[PDB]
RNA sequence: GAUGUGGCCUGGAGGUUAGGACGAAGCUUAUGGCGUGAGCCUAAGAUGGACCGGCCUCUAGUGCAGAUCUUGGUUGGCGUA
RNA sequence: UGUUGGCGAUGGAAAUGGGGUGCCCCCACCCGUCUUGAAACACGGACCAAGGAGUCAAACAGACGCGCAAGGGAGGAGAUAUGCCAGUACUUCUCUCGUACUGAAAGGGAGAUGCAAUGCAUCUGUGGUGUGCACACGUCAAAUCCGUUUGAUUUGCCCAACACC
């Protein structure tokens, strides 16, 4: 079950990184939109 | 010397166990739990195999091919709840657990219905 | 309606599956398709592509050519590293013009009886592709080789023999019949042996 | 097999791959190699240069048995020696003997590098072959 | 090198043990078997043709145009119903067939000696895998072993009753019964042409010479073979490999001298050795699942509005600043 | 298109086939948000979030 | 019974396009040029080949020794 | 036994493709033959003529081959044929062959009733 | 005009699996079901009376609407000239 | 994704699909042919059954399948299992295509490197240069579950192949 455990641990590590990347991209888009409007 | 992959390549297209009627391909094999013509369920050529069969009365008999007495056709198959049947099969072949479970349930239901129509 | 004129002239003709009837060839293709799909190496992709080809496009190779190219690679290689494994998707034939060869490991689809005997006598090993998949699953430290195609009689016949600059053989069963007119200047003319 | 032919694929198509305009007729260009000088001249001249004419002297009663003369090369000489004698061979001592006319050859030619010294019995030999074998360490003996 | 038991003809007891010949480990090439069978089955054929004068024994001529009939040759004369009728044509009644058949059609075929030997070897190797025998169609459920080797004392039998008792003891009677029950009258025109009955194929019994066949000759559904001349048309009926063969011990020990091994040459077929295999181990799933391959396999990875304007969810997903405007 | 000389001399030669003019910010925004598709692996894919744009262009100036 | 036209010929020629010319560095033969310069060029090429063989031998010896 | 549920069957076209002008000649069969006349109106695709079969008339693969009862037909010839159907109960129904006699039909019908296997033409 | 098709169909051969006097082949159809189609399959016969189906290979005198096509039967004109 | 009615209580029922015949609104020139052009005042065309047209042999070539490979393979014939068996099993010698070409012919007849100018010496070897799979050694980007991938390029050897010698 070592392979399965490694797989599930890696997936649990990847989901949070995807969420963090989404969160960062949202802020970057907000800032750029504001400056373009100005 | 001659492996299961080679044998499957040799018999996939014509065999006495392959029934191609209409456009449907079934299997006549007595050691097949499904009827599908695939290498997983072709139990007559695999090294290890297990099949669930109906027995006298309400008994359920499981026939197991251990894989050590192949090349001795008279000693190839030695006989032996649905969870118990599945655990019995999974010792020989783990990938034959779900189908054997469902087959045991279906055999029990067939026996019950036969007893019903016998009483009627 | 969309204007897509001359869009079928971009289509390419590839093979994608084998016409061979050999079950062992089919087993090898089954192994190396999986390897090429699940591995990042280019060796596996090339080998898979060459297993699908036809017999005429897998030309045989020679023991003398193998020995020569291996030596030319070896002269510039560190003295502590090991020699590679020669791999050919095809047949390996013998050469009576070279008597003594080094000890090499060769992998091929087929060996002549004489080629096998020569290799083992010199002190090497003849491998199969299923053994190679277990020694070098990615193809590290290998020498991929191809056999020669030109010099075939069909290739030397391709073309028109009677146009200037052309040196292809004609289709004729009598060797003394087609000489003279169009081949000698004493007759009407002679076709020119060179053209820019 | 008749079931693999093109005529089985063409049942129902009237013209069988020959067209409605120019039909399929008996002999639309002549019979055989007719017209090699008039209306098939481009074909003849571009694919078969040299078909027409004469060249050379004649030879009224040719017999090939007196003209028999096959050839073999120095780098090919090892096909005529057995493996054990080839291993036992070495320049300076006792060498194997090869009989060309018994093996089916008449002349010895001198292409390549000789892979084993030996004594060769031949009906004919060339200058380079003789010189090369003498340098290698063997010899050539004329026979009849 | 594996070993094979030898069974007694009168009981369920093993008598000796013999090593397995190399021909049974030789490679199996069903494509070669099918090719050689297709071309070898053509050599026992006879010629047929029509007469060279048939359909053309009249003095017919065309009537031309001007008379309002089609331009086909017509039979001459008067006084019979055949006068003025069409002649000389595949389209006419009583006419000549299109392209009459000749007797110099190619009836027979040539096969390379090495390819014939290869096919025989492959069929022999396939006749030792018990699943291929079952797929071909034999009933071998209660058979002691495959290959089945039997003592050499059955060559002294003199009565078919003794022969049948031996067959029942060895348990070939199931396949013999299959053959017996299959017999019938053939469908189609063939039963008018000396081909009236059909039946299945049973077991084949191989003997070291041509002696001792008197008791077995009449048993329906059993075929007899000589080890010195083995026939591919019998080792692979229909072009399918996997016949059921019963070996006598002496023939079993002669197999190695007849066919040679992977290194030593045959003493009978001059300069013939068993073909080398293309794969050393033919199990590619084990290689695919091994640890050496799995260490290098690539790691696995983790895996509706459309308007964009006037859909607030999509608009705010694309442009998070629309709130502050 | 860019409205320079090499492109103006191309637009002048196919005039009976086209209509053109100078767009505004509203027009550009509407045509990107409503009817904008990308070329991803040679396929036509509709724009649905900013992650596709970032992955396609791989340039810190286009995210 | 004799007619001539150039109507469909441009379209036929452009179906598989007009192929461009071969690059000038390919098929750059010198046959038929000025013989006095041709001979001197041949001599220089021979010397160059000898030099290349010597250079490779030197490289091999250096790699082997060190 | 009840079949597995599926989507609704659509059947793009119900009418058959019959040959051109077979209604005027008794000897012409109604089966489809492709018209290859140079002036043929059916081949030239005029407005009021009949249609020719295409690949676009093909049926949805999710429901192809399914009969109105919800099963698919598998032909059987004797009693032992039902044992290979006993496991795929809700997918396939058996069709007794035309030439099986009454004596065997009785046994087949009884066994199928015991095993709970649907017969398309049972009794 | 070219090519492809675990694309359809007909007579025979090597294999394999099956059916039939409790009714084979053939024939009839407001007998439905399946397939884009060539076609396949079931039903009924208040038809028939002895043979024959599926699958894998092999083989050929292997698919008809028209040729002033060939042979046999029929037909309007017509109870007319 | 649930909710409310109608019909349906085992019938000669209800319902939904097929099939048949009539009707209404709309659409719609007669097939095969040759021809630049046919619905043609251009030819063939009363109905049905059965028959009816790219085939066999032989020489050569290209593509694809199979066996062996500097060799491949007979044919004719023989010998004994063999006396069901026109098949299958076995075979010395030879013959043929190929490994070498060129000249009208008499005839002649192809390795590399170094040193010299029918010369001499060595023999584990691409005759040289340009463009060139894979493999090996470095370096840099992008992405990343941080383990590696996907790319680029430098150098070594360059297999097949093409260009110039
Ligand atoms: K003209
Ligand atoms: K339909
Ligand atoms: Mg050559
Ligand atoms: Mg003269
Ligand atoms: Mg008898
Ligand atoms: Mg027409
Ligand atoms: Mg016939
Ligand atoms: Mg009707
Ligand atoms: Mg015919
Ligand atoms: Mg030559
Ligand atoms: Na023509
Ligand atoms: Na014309
Ligand atoms: Na006749
Ligand atoms: Na037209
Ligand atoms: Na007809
Ligand atoms: Na015509
Ligand atoms: Na017309």
What string of DSSP letters covers D66-103? GG---EEEGGGGGGGS-HHHHHH--TTS---EEEHHHH
Helix or strand holding residue E175 (H, E): helix E173-182
* Cβ proximity of B61 and B53 under 8 Å: yes
Does chain C reach chain A with at least 3 CB pairs under 8 Å? no
Could you tell me where the beta strands, DSSP code E, fall in E153-254?
184-185, 197-198, 204-207, 223-226, 245-248
Kindly report the number of other CB atoms within 10 A of residue D125's CB atom: 19
* Cβ proximity of F37 and F46 under 8 Å: yes
Cα E260 to Cα B5, B22, E274: the distances in Å are: 27, 48, 7
- Dig out the tokens for G38 from the structure: 């041709």
**Residue in chain E nearest F63 by alpha carbon:** E318
Asked if the C-beta of E276 comes within 8 angstroms of chain C's C-beta atoms, the answer is yes
Tell me which of A28, A31, A38 to substitute to probe the interface with F (most F C-beta atoms closer than 10 Å).
Answer: A28
Name the experimental technique.
cryo-EM
Helix or strand holding residue F7 (H, E): helix F5-11
Query: Beta strand pairing status for C85-93 and C61-62?
Result: parallel
Quick one: resolution in A? 2.9
Instruction: Return the sign of the alpha-carbon dihedral for residues E203, E205, E206, E209.
Output: negative
Kindly report the number of other CB atoms within 10 A of residue D67's CB atom: 7
- Dig out the tokens for B101 from the structure: 């479970």
For residues F52 and F45, what is the distance between their CA atoms, to the nearest angstrom? Answer: 9
- Dig out the tokens for C31 from the structure: 């192994």
* Cβ proximity of E199 and E178 under 8 Å: no
Which residues, in sequence order, are CB contacts of C95 under 8 Å at separation 6+? C62, C63, C64
Distance from Cα D14 to the centre of ligand 9, integer Å: 16
**D50:C181 CB<8 A:** yes
Which of H35, H36, H28, H30 lies closest to H51, judged by CA? Answer: H35
For residues E258 and E269, what is the distance between their CA atoms, to the nearest angstrom? Answer: 7
- Dig out the tokens for E42 from the structure: 């053509």
* Cβ proximity of B31 and B65 under 8 Å: yes
- Dig out the tokens for E38 from the structure: 């297709």
**C137:E293 CB<8 A:** yes
Kindly report the number of other CB atoms within 10 A of residue E241's CB atom: 29
Cα A31 to Cα A24, A25, B26, E319, H13: the distances in Å are: 11, 10, 64, 10, 57
For residues C187 and D54, what is the distance between their CA atoms, to the nearest angstrom? Answer: 9
For residues D137 and E259, what is the distance between their CA atoms, to the nearest angstrom? Answer: 45
SS3 E84: coil
Maximum distance among all alpha carbons in chain E?
A: 115
Asked if the C-beta of A7 comes within 8 angstroms of chain E's C-beta atoms, the answer is yes
Annotated binding-site residue numbers of D: 17
Q: How close does chain H come to D18, measured CA to CA in Å?
A: 15
The β-bridge partners of D119 are D97, D139
- Dig out the tokens for B73 from the structure: 């056709």
In the block, residue with structure tokens 């079934």: B26
**H87:B33 CB<8 A:** yes
* Cβ proximity of E141 and E161 under 8 Å: no
Distance from Cα H47 to the centre of ligand 8, integer Å: 29
Question: Which DSSP state fits G64?
Answer: H
In the block, residue with structure tokens 């086209």: F18
For residues C68 and C88, what is the distance between their CA atoms, to the nearest angstrom? Answer: 15
Q: How close does chain F come to E321, measured CA to CA in Å?
A: 13
* Cβ proximity of F50 and E318 under 8 Å: yes
For residues E268 and E311, what is the distance between their CA atoms, to the nearest angstrom? Answer: 88
The β-bridge partners of D135 are none
Residue of D47, D50, D112 lying closest to C183 (CB–CB): D50
Question: Could you give the angle at which helices B97-119 and B82-92 cross, rounded to 10 degrees?
Answer: 140
Question: Could you give the angle at which helices E113-126 and E30-40 cross, rounded to 10 degrees?
Answer: 120
For residues B85 and B71, what is the distance between their CA atoms, to the nearest angstrom? Answer: 27
Total residues belonging to chain B? 120
Provide DSSP, E33-82. Answer: HHHHHHHHTTSS-------TTTT--S--B---SSSSS-S--B---SSSTT
Distance from Cα H96 to the centre of ligand 8, integer Å: 28
Strand I close residues, chain E 209-268, CB < 7 angstroms: 237-240
**Residue in chain D nearest C174 by alpha carbon:** D51
Asked if the Cβ of residue E92 lies within 7 A of any atom of strand I, the reply is yes
In the block, residue with structure tokens 């012409």: H28
Question: Which DSSP state fits D121?
Answer: E
Contacts by E141-144 with C-beta closer than 8 Å and gap 24+?
A: E141/B73, E141/B74, E141/E174, E142/B73, E142/B74, E142/E171, E142/E174, E143/B73, E143/B74, E143/E170, E143/E171, E143/E172, E144/B72, E144/B73, E144/B74, E144/E5, E144/E7, E144/E12, E144/E170, E144/E171
Strand I close residues, chain H 57-86, CB < 7 angstroms: 57-59, 63-68, 73, 75, 77-78, 80
């Amino acid at each position: 079950a070592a392979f399965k455990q490694q797989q599930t641990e890696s997936f649990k590590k990847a989901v949070v990184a995807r969420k963090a990347a989404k969160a960062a991209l949202k802020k970057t888009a907000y800032l750029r939109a504001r400056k373009y409007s100005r | 010397s001659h492996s299961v992959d080679l044998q499957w390549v040799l018999v996939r297209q014509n065999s006495r166990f392959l029934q191609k009627r209409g456009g449907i391909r079934m299997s006549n094999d007595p050691f097949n739990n499904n009827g599908n013509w695939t290498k997983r369920h072709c139990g007559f050529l695999n090294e290890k195999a297990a099949v669930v069969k109906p027995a006298k009365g309400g008994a359920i008999c499981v026939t197991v091919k251990d894989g050590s007495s192949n090349n001795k056709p008279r000693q190839t198959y030695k006989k032996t709840r649905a969870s118990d049947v599945s655990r019995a099969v999974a010792a020989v072949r783990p990938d034959l657990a779900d189908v054997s479970f469902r087959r045991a349930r279906r055999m029990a239901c067939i026996a019950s219905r036969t007893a019903k129509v016998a009483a009627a | 309606g969309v204007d897509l004129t001359g869009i079928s002239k971009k289509s390419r003709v590839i093979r994608h599956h084998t016409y061979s009837t050999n079950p062992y060839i089919k087993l090898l293709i089954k192994l190396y398709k999986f390897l090429a799909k699940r591995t990042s190496s280019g060796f596996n992709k090339v080998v898979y592509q060459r297993l699908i080809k036809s017999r005429s496009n897998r030309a045989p190779i020679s023991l003398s050519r193998i020995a020569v190219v291996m030596k030319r690679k070896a002269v510039f290689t560190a003295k502590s590293k090991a020699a590679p494994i020669a791999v050919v998707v095809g047949d390996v034939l013998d050469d009576v013009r070279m008597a003594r060869i080094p000890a090499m490991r060769v992998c091929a689809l087929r060996f002549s009886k004489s080629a096998r005997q020569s290799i083992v006598a010199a002190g090497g090993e003849c491998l199969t592709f299923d053994q190679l998949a277990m020694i070098a699953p990615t193809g590290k430290n290998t020498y991929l080789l191809r056999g020669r195609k030109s010099g075939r009689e069909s290739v030397r016949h391709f073309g028109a023999s009677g146009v200037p600059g052309s040196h292809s053989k004609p289709y004729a069963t009598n060797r003394g019949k087609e000489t003279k007119r169009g081949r000698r200047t004493g007759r009407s003319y002679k076709r020119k042996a060179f053209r820019h | 097999p008749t079931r693999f032919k093109k005529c089985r694929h063409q049942r129902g198509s009237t013209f069988c791959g020959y067209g409605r305009v120019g039909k399929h007729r008996k002999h639309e260009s002549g019979r055989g190699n007719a017209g090699g000088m008039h209306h098939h001249r481009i074909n003849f001249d571009k694919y078969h240069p040299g078909y027409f004419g004469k060249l050379g002297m004649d030879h009224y009663h040719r017999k090939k048995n007196p003209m028999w003369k096959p050839t073999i090369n120095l780098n090919n000489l090892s096909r005529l020696i057995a493996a054990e004698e080839a291993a036992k061979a070495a320049k300076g001592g006792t060498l194997p003997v090869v009989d060309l006319q018994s093996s089916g050859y008449a002349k010895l030619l001198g292409n390549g590098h000789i892979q084993v010294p030996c004594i060769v019995k031949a009906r004919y030999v060339s200058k380079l072959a003789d010189k090369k074998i003498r340098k290698a360490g063997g010899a050539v003996v004329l026979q009849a | 090198r594996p070993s094979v038991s030898v069974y007694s003809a009168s009981s369920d007891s093993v008598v000796g043990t013999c090593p397995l010949p190399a021909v049974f480990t030789a490679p199996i090439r069903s494509d070669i078997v099918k090719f050689v069978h297709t071309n070898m089955a053509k050599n026992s054929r006879q010629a047929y043709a029509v007469n060279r004068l048939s359909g053309m024994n009249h003095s017919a001529h065309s009537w031309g145009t001007g008379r309002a009939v089609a331009r086909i040759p017509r039979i001459s004369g008067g006084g019979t119903s055949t006068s003025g009728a069409g002649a000389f044509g595949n389209m006419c009644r009583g006419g000549r067939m299109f392209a009459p058949t000749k007797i110099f059609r190619r009836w027979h075929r040539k096969i390379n000696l090495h390819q014939k030997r290869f096919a025989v070897v492959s069929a022999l190797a396939a006749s030792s895998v018990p699943s291929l025998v079952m797929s071909r169609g034999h009933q071998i459920g209660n058979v002691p072993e495959v290959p089945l080797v039997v003592e050499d004392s059955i060559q002294g039998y003199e009565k078919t009753k003794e022969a049948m008792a031996f067959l029942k003891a060895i348990a070939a009677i199931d396949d013999v019964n299959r053959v017996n029950d299959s017999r019938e009258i053939r469908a189609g025109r063939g039963k008018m042409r000396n081909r009236r009955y059909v039946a299945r194929r049973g077991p084949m019994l191989v003997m070291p010479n041509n002696k001792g066949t008197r008791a077995f000759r009449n048993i329906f559904g059993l075929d007899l073979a000589n080890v010195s001349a083995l026939n591919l048309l019998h080792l692979a009926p229909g072009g399918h490999v996997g016949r059921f063969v019963i070996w006598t011990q002496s023939a079993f020990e002669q197999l190695d001298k007849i066919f040679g091994t992977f290194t030593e040459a045959s003493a009978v077929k001059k300069g013939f050795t068993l073909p080398a295999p293309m794969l050393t181990n033919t199990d590619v799933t084990r290689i695919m699942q091994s640890e050496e391959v799995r260490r290098v396999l690539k790691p696995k990875k983790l895996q509706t509005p459309t308007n964009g304007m006037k859909n607030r969810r999509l608009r705010l997903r694309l442009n998070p600043y629309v709130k502050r405007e | 298109v860019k409205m320079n000389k090499p492109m103006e001399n191309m637009l002048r030669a196919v005039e009976p086939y086209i209509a053109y003019g100078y767009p505004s910010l509203a027009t550009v925004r509407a045509m990107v948000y409503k009817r904008g598709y990308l070329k991803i692996n040679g396929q036509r894919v509709k724009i649905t979030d900013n992650q596709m744009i970032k992955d396609k262009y791989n340039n810190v100036d286009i995210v | 019974s004799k007619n001539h036209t150039n109507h469909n010929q441009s379209s036929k020629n452009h179906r598989n396009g007009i192929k461009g010319p071969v690059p000038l560095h390919l098929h750059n033969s010198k046959r038929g040029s000025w013989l006095p310069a041709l001979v001197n060029a041949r001599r220089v090429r021979k010397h160059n080949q000898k030099a290349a063989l010597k250079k490779r031998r030197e490289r091999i010896a250096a790699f082997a020794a060190k | 036994v009840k079949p597995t549920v599926s989507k609704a069957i659509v059947k793009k076209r119900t009418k058959r493709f019959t040959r051109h002008r077979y209604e005027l000649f008794p000897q012409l069969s109604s089966s489809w033959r492709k018209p290859r006349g140079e002036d043929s109106p059916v081949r030239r695709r005029y407005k009021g003529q009949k249609a020719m079969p295409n690949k676009g008339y093909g049926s949805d693969r999710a429901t192809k081959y399914i009969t109105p009862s919800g099963f698919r037909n598998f032909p059987i010839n004797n009693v032992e044929d039902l044992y290979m159907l006993v496991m795929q109960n809700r997918k396939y129904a058996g069709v007794i062959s035309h030439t099986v006699g009454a004596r065997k039909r009785k046994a087949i019908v009884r066994k199928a009733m015991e095993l709970d296997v649907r017969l398309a033409n049972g009794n």
